[model samples]
Target chain A: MAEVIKSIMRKFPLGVAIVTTNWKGELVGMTVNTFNSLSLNPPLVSFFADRMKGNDIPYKESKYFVVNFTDNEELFNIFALKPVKERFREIKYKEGIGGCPILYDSYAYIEAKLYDTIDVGDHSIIVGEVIDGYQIRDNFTPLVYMNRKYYKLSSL
Target chain B: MAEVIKSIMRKFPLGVAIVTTNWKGELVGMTVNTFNSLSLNPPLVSFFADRMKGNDIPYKESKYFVVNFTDNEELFNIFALKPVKERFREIKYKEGIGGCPILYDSYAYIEAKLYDTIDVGDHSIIVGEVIDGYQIRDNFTPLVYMNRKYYKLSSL
Candidate 1:
């Protein structure tokens, strides 16, 4: 079952999201591809981050976070960065509407009011309600992650 | 917030799946794309489906449902058709280990025992635990859905 899922998921190109959080005022980001739509009437969304608690760098010191919708230009910023200083050089812009750093040039972003973090096996499913957001641009091509590499829309 | 999430998710490519069950000898299937990995330790996974249960489908009738992964060849089968029999004919599958019709050629599949379902606004977040089975075809390319379309793997 594991092999079958991994194989099929690779066929679908996903918009890579760099989920960011201010860890006690320090910025930390992780490139994730597991995002999904959770609700619409009340507005919600979610994603999973593997838990390490004291060991996992991206998820270690955070609760509230931001989901940056990656566009073609930001691909290099995420996949090309060195972990230690990745946050320092890649993103642009100031604190977001909710005070988290917003990466400039994304298609858009959302500030989530996290409600639950359920532990499921090796990962943590982060569920958040869409609290506030801002859309700066529209009609940009999104960057995709496939088999740990990046690809663009072949048709759309 | 809703608009931001919709635009972002609309760009993230995901694999399409059909969740079904044997409801008194009749097969019930619903198309799903928001499926996710909830936990790995207990082998838990989840998917969110709209709660507007038109006709109550399978969720209201069965105690368990099968999540069948889709491949390139099986994509067309998921499109809704009338007469019910027409939809069944479009699919090529055999009885699975669980007695549910397993869509053949799926990149991978998981037979899970339903754990819980959460009512989150307009959708139902259905979760389950992996009970048995693993790996399907080692060489099969996965089928993915992005921008509301299938992008079958072009290469390994």
Candidate 2:
């Protein structure tokens, strides 16, 4: 079941985003590809996070979070698999609309208000109401995840 | 705000999937780029559907649905923009496990049981618990939607 699911899903391309929030005065974030827009009328968005048994601090602490769209492979690698303590020490970022840290190099940033949460098995679906969102840079190729690796978008 | 939101989101690449189910004996499906895996332990997945006032039948009627991954641009375009009445008129599909219609040419198919639904502004986040899923074609590249266009994945 695991192999079948992975083999199939890895073919689907996804954009990478780092969802960040303030965790007791420390910066906390996780790299995710599950982020997508849910609605336009009220500007809602969502992403799925793996259920962290030991530390849900970043998951549970913030009422607001920032989704940073980065095409940098190195940044994605660090946030995706690195230890939580070593994830944010060197990245340059600034606080956005809701005091959430937005990575400077991201092509876009969306500051979202926590709207709802749904637990699905080993993960939690976090829904956010977009308080403010916009492009941070223009003419940038977005990072894509496919086949268990990252790639830059190329023209058709 | 709306334009900005759309502009930023258009930069994010997403895979195309057709969410289908039997709606009162009629085959129904909608093309979506919002599908993503939510959990692994219990095998969960999710997708977003616009709250179309006239045709929420497929969204409301199905407790189980099949998510078909197709790399075909024509299929994605048809399901993405075609009227509901004309969408499935000539398509070829077979009823898979749980009475869901699986597109014959999809790279993979996932039969899921509706686990939860959250109504956000103009859309609904539909979460599904995977009942059965498998790859149909091992080597086919997945279709991607980005910048208002369809793209085929290339090797990194």
Candidate 3:
């Protein structure tokens, strides 16, 4: 069951986003291909954080976050591959809803108030109610991940 | 804010899927670009259903669903554009976990037991505990939806 699930998901291509927040006074974020739009009327969005991973605590404590939708692989790797404490060290960014850092040149961004957090499996689903969303770059290539590789999209 | 989110999500390319189920002997399903892999440890997956839409009740009552990941435009439109009752008439399929209809030749499919449902905004987040997942086609093109258009992916 585990192998089958993992194999299929690995073949699947997903849109990626970096979820950022200010924890107490510490800044931290993580990259997730699990980010998705959940609702329209009340304006909601969602992403799943592995409970086993180190970055989820601040999101629960700060009660706020910013979802940066981008194609910047450099920024993505900084959060995804760098040590948690070093994620924000040299990178420059602006603050969003809860002093959450928003990277420059993200195609778009959603500033959200922590709406609710639901626990399941070994991950928790983080729900966000939109406070503001802005489109920064109008024309850009999208970055997608599949089977441990990044790919670009083209319209046919 | 609503317009901003709508615009950004419109540009965002999301992998498309058709989630099917056997509801009280009635076969029903809907197309969603919101399907995502939520967790690995407990083997979880999720998709959002708009309560405002005509198709969500069946998912709530069926207690099971099968997610078909495919690049087939015809299958996607059959579930997405056809009238509700007419969705299953011409399509031939097999049963997955809980008798949910599994469409033929999907690139991959996941059979899941309905785990939990959480209501938010104008939608409900349906969580599925994967019973089994299988990758069917080895070499196939992926179909994505972006800005109300379908697209194909290419490696750069």
Candidate 4:
């Protein structure tokens, strides 16, 4: 079953994102590929984050967060470091409303409040309402994740 | 902000799915493009049904649903339909576990029980814990929905 699922995932491509939330001035984030827009009329977005041992600290404390939609050039920034304080320090951004960091180089940025979270299994489905800010980049290709590898958008 | 977002989505790619559930022996479904995988271990998946009106039937009433991952070849069976029942009839599947219609031609299928849901701005993010099912297909290219258009994987 696992092999079959893995093969199917090869056909399903997803965008890469670094979902960040500052917890009392400390930065916490994880590389994510499950980020997708949920609605348009009110501008809603959602992503799934797995709850690890001590990593729950970020999800619990942060009431607001920013989804930095990265491109091929920013892929290195995403996988550059391990899960630590240095991970966030390597990146730069300005604080939007509710103190969420909005990356300057993102193809798009969605500043959202923690509208709600639903417990699925080992992860929580976080749904955010786009309260402030929006996409910024143009002509930049979005970094895509598929089959455990990364890819860039086509020119044509 | 909305225009910037619209332009960004023009580059964003997503998969299309038919989220079906069995409601008291009757089958009901809706086409969705916002489906995502949440967890790997406990096997969780989620999707947002952007339906404005459900009349009276709610997700909880269905209890279980099948996520029918579509391929480009099946686009006609989906977008060409007029009403709900007509499209459902074209869907090829028999009674699956929990009486849900397991779309036979799906690129992949996940049978899951509704775990939790959160009422957000306009849509509800419903999550489910995948119990047990086969991965099904992988060789076939899965359908992609981008800028409200359906695209197949480019082998070239």
Q: Score the docking of each candidate (DockQ).
A: 0.45, 0.64, 0.71, 0.38
Candidate numbers, best lDDT first, in rank order: 3, 2, 4, 1
| Deviation from native of the Cα of residue A50 in model 2, angstroms | 1.4
For model 2 chain A, the run of ten residues with the poorest summed lDDT: A52-61
Model 2: pairs clashing at backbone N, Cα or C within 3 Å? none
Query: Sort by TM-score, best first: what order?
Result: 3, 2, 4, 1
Candidate 2 lDDT over A51-104, as tens digits, reads 755233465567888889887888898887888888878788887655678888
Report lDDT (Cα) of residue A38, candidate 2: 79
TM-score of 1: 0.80
lDDT of 4 by residue, B81-142 (tens): 45756766665677786888777777677788887776566667777777765666646655
Query: C-alpha displacement of B141 in model 3, angstroms?
Result: 0.9
Candidate 1 chain B weakest lDDT stretch, 10 residues = B73-82
**Model 2 C-alpha lDDT per residue in residues B74-146, reported as the tens digit of each score:** 8888787788788777688898755778988787888888887767778877778888887767767666788
**Alpha carbon deviation, residue B80, candidate 4 (Å):** 8.3
**For every model shown, what is its TM-score relative to the native structure?**
0.80, 0.93, 0.95, 0.82
Question: Against the unseen true structure, what C-alpha lDDT does each candidate score?
Answer: 0.63, 0.78, 0.83, 0.66
Candidate 3, pairs of clashing residues: none
Worst 10 residues of 1 chain A by lDDT: A52-61
Residue A37 lDDT in candidate 4 = 74
In candidate 4 chain B, what residue range of length 10 has the lowest lDDT sum?
B72-81
RMSD for each of the candidates: 3.7, 2.0, 1.6, 3.4
